[PDB]
Amino acid sequence: GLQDDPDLQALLKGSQLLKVKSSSWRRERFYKLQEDCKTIWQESRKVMRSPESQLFSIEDIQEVRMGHRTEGLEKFARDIPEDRCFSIVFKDQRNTLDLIAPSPADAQHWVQGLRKIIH
Numbered sequence: 456g457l458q459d460d461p462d463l464q465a466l467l468k469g470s471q472l473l474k475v476k477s478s479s480w481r482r483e484r485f486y487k488l489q490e491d492c493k494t495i496w497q498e499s500r501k502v503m504r505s506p507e508s509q510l511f512s513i514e515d516i517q518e519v520r521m522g523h524r525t526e527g528l529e530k531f532a533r534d535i536p537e538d539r540c541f542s543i544v545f546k547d548q549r550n551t552l553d554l555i556a557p558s559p560a561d562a563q564h565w566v567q568g569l570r571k572i573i574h
């Protein structure tokens with residue numbers, strides 16, 4: 456795995472994805488799976504951000520959905536194809552991340568890659 460898995464190799468490099476929050480709010484955010492295959496670094500532009508706030512554990516993930524499988528994606532990303540969007544659902548209070556991949560290969564890597572680590 457990891458070194459031999461093409462999805463995980465892609466995630467270790469990181470990707471520029473678009474985070475969907477509303478009709479207007481759709482902004483670029485860089486995500487990158489860390490070498491320990493345990494955490495993900497995420498770009499943030501929050502008023503009071505911090506290095507620890509920009510990491511989240513794979514252990515906090517319930518599932519990763521492909522396609523328009525969330526309200527936010529069903530309402531705000533109609534213009535985006537089914538194969539270029541996905542969502543990361545969390546176990547705790549962390550809000551679900553609705554994401555748009557620059558290409559189907561990217562969405563594939565994230566969904567498949569995270570599913571491999573979660574299971």
Ligand SMILES: O=P(O)(O)O[C@@H]1[C@H](O)[C@H](O)[C@@H](OP(=O)(O)O)[C@H](OP(=O)(O)O)[C@H]1O
Nearest residue numbers: 474476480484498499500501502550551552
């Ligand atoms: O609306 P503003 O003032 O632009 O600020 C963003 C807004 O609060 C988003 O809801 C938030 O995403 P989450 O809901 O996922 O926190 C994003 O965080 P981010 O910068 O960490 O993506 C903020 O920057």
